[PDB]
Amino acid sequence: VPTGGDDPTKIAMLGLTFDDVLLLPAASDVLPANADTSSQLTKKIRLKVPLVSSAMDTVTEARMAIAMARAGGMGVLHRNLPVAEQAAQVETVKRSGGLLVGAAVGVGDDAWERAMALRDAGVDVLVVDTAHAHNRKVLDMVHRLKTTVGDEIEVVGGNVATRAAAAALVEAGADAVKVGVGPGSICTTRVVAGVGAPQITAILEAVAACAPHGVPVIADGGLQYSGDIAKALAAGASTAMLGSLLAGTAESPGELILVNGKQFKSYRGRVPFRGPLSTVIHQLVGGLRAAMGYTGSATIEELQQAQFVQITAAG
Amino acid sequence: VPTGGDDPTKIAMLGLTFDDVLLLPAASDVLPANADTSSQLTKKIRLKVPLVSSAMDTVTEARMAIAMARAGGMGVLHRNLPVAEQAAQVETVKRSGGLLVGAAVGVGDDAWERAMALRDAGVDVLVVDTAHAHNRKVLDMVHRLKTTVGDEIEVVGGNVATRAAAAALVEAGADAVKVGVGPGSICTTRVVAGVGAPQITAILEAVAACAPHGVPVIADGGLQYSGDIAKALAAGASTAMLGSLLAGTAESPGELILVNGKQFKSYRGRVPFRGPLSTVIHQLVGGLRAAMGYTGSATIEELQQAQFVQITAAG
Amino acid sequence: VPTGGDDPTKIAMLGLTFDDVLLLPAASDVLPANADTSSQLTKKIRLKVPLVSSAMDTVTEARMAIAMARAGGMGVLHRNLPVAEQAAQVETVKRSGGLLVGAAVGVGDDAWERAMALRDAGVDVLVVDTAHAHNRKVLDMVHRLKTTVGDEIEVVGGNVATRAAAAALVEAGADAVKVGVGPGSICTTRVVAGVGAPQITAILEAVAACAPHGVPVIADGGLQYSGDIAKALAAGASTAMLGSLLAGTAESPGELILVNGKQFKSYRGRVPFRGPLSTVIHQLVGGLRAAMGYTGSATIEELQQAQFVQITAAG
Amino acid sequence: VPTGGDDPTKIAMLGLTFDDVLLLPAASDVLPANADTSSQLTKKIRLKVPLVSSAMDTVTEARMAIAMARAGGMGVLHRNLPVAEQAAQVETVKRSGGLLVGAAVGVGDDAWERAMALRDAGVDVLVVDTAHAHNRKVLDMVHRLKTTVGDEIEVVGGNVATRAAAAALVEAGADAVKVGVGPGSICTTRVVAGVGAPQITAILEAVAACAPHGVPVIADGGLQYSGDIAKALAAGASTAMLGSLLAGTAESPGELILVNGKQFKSYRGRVPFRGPLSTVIHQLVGGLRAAMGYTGSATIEELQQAQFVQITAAG
């Protein structure tokens, strides 16, 4: 093997991240303003805008979830709080109109009780929210939820970064699979544990397992620019989950931070303050619409068939 | 596939930009001072210097177009102004002697009326000037112009970044094809839309479609140094269109900007002030002539057959 | 050959360092808290934590060796001091309980006398400590020690960076092989001599020679983060030797250095002050445990079978 | 072709520079102090140290040439001065003992008269010193000199960066071939003309043409560290010519420059002041000797057979 040892499988793949690729323009009859940006969040739930906000306590509580749903996306309420309060946040969202909302649960001791409280409060999507879903405890939770509340509630499982892990969640009954393990995020799993998977490759692999079963993939982590959203969807994802890009909006939890005359909000680090969510979402969707124009993609399903060019460090 | 998924065509190519390659020296009987730098702008129009200025409101109005033509190149007047004023700028150029001039038009509602006014004013080249030419509306405009005023006026179409798009413009009747979509320019299409094509690869692909039909390619975007001009032509382009490299000249629109004791002009950002156009063109042509000496290229047509070496990030 | 000349073996391999790769998550039943981090330092000696401190006079004297052994690893006492004092440092460690300790020796004139003094003082591991072990003098020393004191003392040989060099040490009787020649360390062998071997490739190659003979490999040099420890072991090493990561701990030789309000210690350069060794080791083992969770590795032997993804400069 | 177009030869090679490679350690019986650093400058002339100073007016006049010869290398006197003065500099060197000296000549109108004056003054090596030697005028000059003064004087030709160009100089009768065209030097041929060849690949290619005819290659340009000298020789060069590395020595032309409390000398830019030449040469040869130890190279001829590992941007 050119890189060492005698085992060609030891280095299993060349992992590409968003910055490694660009979408190629293609024949187009699509104007950006006329593109259809709707996409499946889960097998049953379609969003008007293929964006959801991260289940993080610096990103999504009730205010963010309401704003996301109104913008045509969805929020996933974080679970770093008592069960009754998360459930109360769900109720708050639901009484602000007929708005979709999700909520995270883990696989710990209180996770089942949390899930039932969220169900009672009227949640639409339960996200089984773990660092590493390729694990019997996680798969069992997904399956148990699906078999218990699956008629009324869509169940998302994550996170994964390989084809085999995605396939396991599909088999367990997941309604969507969330992709992102060491995706290049603030937790720096890559530096601390040495573990990760560049996101374009991770999405391509997960989609290879999910699309043949009609299960949408949520790209979760490492998205820095509006152009990354287009790349994630073209790699085959159906939606993108955003943390850092939304943590600086007015609707996110936390107060303004002023450093050297500039405004920031906290992210757990800090991110530039961006103003209202509606403004950020408008910019992001603007970039996505531009990509759909350039690639001749009338719908997100067409964008999922677009081609890339791989670029070098110089590019 | 080593980079993910099961489709080898998903990542269609490895895209190289100017910084990825160098021209290889070759046997030479050519002194730089003796090289012939003339080249086809379009099927019919040959320039003494293979350079044209961008149709941008911070680069080319009448003053720039006159200076470019006198230097042996050509300017393309921007279209971000009323039809009558663009036409008046064409007349201004034409009465400063027998000087070649081009002008941009779009495909919008006023585009045809604009084109006819430019024709009436005596324009030599009409540039159908769009972000993405691989589109029926753009192709129809190129064809309609060619069939209406094509005896008297050369029609350029752009921009493209693929072989198929270039082939479409050739079929529509374009007299030259302009290449540059997300080429690494100020609009940052790459960041916003996630779309682009590294320019050396884009030129190689466009030339594969254009040269067999005798249609010149204009390299448009991403040229930062005189050496990039030589690389663009060696990749097969016949001329290079320059924005950032000319936006800092005296002849470009806009006033001097003084920041921290240094002089700049606006580019839409800012670029260092460079003095007279003649000085910049002299430097650029000097670099091109040096490249022709090193590669043994007596003419631009010979330079188009030169070879590259690909270099690494370390290089 | 694409890179020049007619000899495909002139450039023998593509060398990967830690930053070039990430561990891929895999199916897991392993919780980080439950992983077994024990590993072979030598054929006979197993450590509770697979970490040893460098035989450097800014890293390991008695205080560090005692702290390392108590933390479940081991220190290797440096040899930049008189024989009697190194031996006295060994005695000091041994009387602080039943603690494992190693000590470096060279191949110079006093090296044999040094080794016998260390043996007399009760050392557990002798490390034949050279810049380049692929040399008859070094191999002879390893063999002579092994044949003289090998029943009571384990003999480590190093350093190497190739399969052939590792094989030579195995043949000479080494109980462990230490890998790291121009690994990216403070001596900058790479810059001064132009010599080196990226560590992931060097470990893969050494392990190819050592594992079939049941000889552990010690990864020595270039480890900057806790994640690098996991990568080194997954490449096949059994332990990691740390210099820069430990030189900033309280237990290392040298005084505090205050520069611009920040605290440092000397490394021979300087490194940030990190506090007690126990704290650093806790963080490092925490990262290793996380990696074992993500990869489904119940033991270090299982981690040695994990797979990598190669990443780009963008990643 | 993956990088564009339909011609696989358009991008002819992947060019590696010094920073792209490292020397691999190998079995060694060689101590650095015992290595033989002597090497052929030309077919007939062997130097004790394989280093020559650049024919540049900020590097080599008489003082530098005398110091280089005394250190066991050689200086090449620059030609940016009247013929009589260059000849007078040759005489000055020759009367400082039995010291080897070279001198540059061009191919211009005064070049032949210059060469005969240098011959009369007792020069040992004439260097036909051009930017691009693959040219009939340059080849004719090399041949004419060789046929006229070749019994008494060795004739070096340069510069080249390809196998074909090197072969042409060999055929013309060159006693050594100098390699370096856009090697990454202060003239920035790469940026201005877009022309160049990464030096490791350029040396490998030139050596492929020169070694079978017993003609030494001089690596000229891009050497920044002592380790680069070892890499250049291992790629097959017999000597290295140094500009930037020597321009900061006391013996080089020009005065001390003080900027922000630091000392520099001019290079035509500026380089840090390094003190006496003897000191710099000592460091450089020290690095070379270390490389010979690591690679088991008893002689420069053995070092020329050493192997590389290619490293990534991360390395």
Which method, experimentally, gave rise to this model? X-ray
CB B166 within 8 A of CB B160: yes
Q: CA distances (Å), D259 to each of A169, D58, D224, D280, in order? A: 64, 18, 22, 22
Of these residues, D26, D187, D208, D290, which one is catalytic? D187
Catalytic status, residue D210: no
Q: Residue D116: which residues within 8 A CB-CB, separation 6 or more?
A: none
Interface residues on A facing C, Cβ-Cβ cutoff 8 A? 1-6, 9-17, 19-20, 131-132, 134-136, 160-162, 164-165, 168, 181-182, 184, 189-198, 201, 313
Q: For chain C, first and last CA: distance in Å?
A: 29
Q: For chain B, first and last CA: distance in Å?
A: 29
Contacts of A228 in chain B (CB under 8 A): 194
Smallest CA–CA separation between C148 and chain A, in Å? Answer: 33
Whether residues D16 and B203 touch (CB distance < 8 A) is answered with: no
Cα D111 from Cα C258, distance rounded (Å) = 62
Q: Which of C16, C27, C228 sits opposite A194 (nearest CB)?
A: C228
For residue C202, the surrounding DSSP H or E stretch is helix C199-210
Q: If you search the block for the tokens 């020329």, which residue do you land on?
A: D304
3-state secondary structure chain A: CCCCCCCCCCEEEEECCHHHEEECCCCCCCCHHHCECCEECCCCCEECCCEEECCCCCCCCHHHHHHHHHCCCEEEECCCCCHHHHHHHHHHHHCCCCCCCEEEECCCCCHHHHHHHHHHHCCCEEEEECCCCCCHHHHHHHHHHHHHHCCCCEEEEEEECCHHHHHHHHHHCCCEEEECCCCCCCCCHHHHCCECCCHHHHHHHHHHHHHHHCCCEEEECCCCCHHHHHHHHHCCCCEEEECCCCCCECCCCCCCEEECCEEEEECCCEEECCECHHHHHHHHHHHHHHHHHHHCCCEHHHHCCCCEEEECCCC
SS3 category, C89? helix
Q: Phi and psi (nearest 5°) for D70?
A: -65, -30
Cα B280 from Cα D30, distance rounded (Å) = 57
Whether residues A28 and B135 touch (CB distance < 8 A) is answered with: yes
CB B93 within 8 A of CB B281: no
Closest CA to D311 of D57, D16, D56: D16
Q: Residue B302: which residues within 8 A CB-CB, separation 6 or more?
A: B292, B295, B296
Cα C59 from Cα C86, distance rounded (Å) = 14
Closest CA to A239 of A220, A223, A252: A220
| Residues of B with catalytic function | 187
- The Cβ-side half-sphere exposure at A9, using a 13 Å CA radius, reads 2
- The Cβ-side half-sphere exposure at B30, using a 13 Å CA radius, reads 23
Cα A41 from Cα A72, distance rounded (Å) = 12
Cα C211 from Cα C133, distance rounded (Å) = 18
Q: Which domain holds residue B58?
A: 1-315
* Pairing verdict, β C102-105 and C125-129: parallel
Cα B179 from Cα B175, distance rounded (Å) = 13
Contacts of B305 in chain D (CB under 8 A): none
Give the neighbor-by-neighbor strand order of the sheet with B257-259. B257-259, B262-266, B270-272
Residue A131 annotated as part of some ligand binding site: yes
CB D125 within 8 A of CB D119: no
Cα C22 from Cα A198, distance rounded (Å) = 9
Question: Which domain CATH number covers A137?
Answer: 3.20.20.70
Whether residues A12 and C307 touch (CB distance < 8 A) is answered with: yes
For residue C161, the tally of other CB atoms under 10 A from its CB is: 32
Query: Which residue type, as a one-letter code, is found at position B102?
Result: G
In chain C, how many domains are there? Answer: 1
Contacts of B23 in chain D (CB under 8 A): 193-196
Q: If you search the block for the tokens 């040399």, which residue do you land on?
A: C135
Q: If you search the block for the tokens 């004791």, which residue do you land on?
A: B261
CB D229 within 8 A of CB D235: no
Angle at B82 between CA B81 and CA B88, to 5 degrees: 95
Q: Which of C15, C136, C168 sits opposite D310 (nearest CB)?
A: C15
Which chains reach chain D with 3 or more Cβ–Cβ distances below 8 angstroms?
B, C
Contacts of B206 in chain D (CB under 8 A): none
Cα D97 from Cα A104, distance rounded (Å) = 86
Handedness of CA D248, D250, D251, D257 (dihedral sign): positive
Closest CA to B248 of B17, B56, B37: B56
Structure tokens given for A146? 């699906």
CB A182 within 8 A of CB A201: no
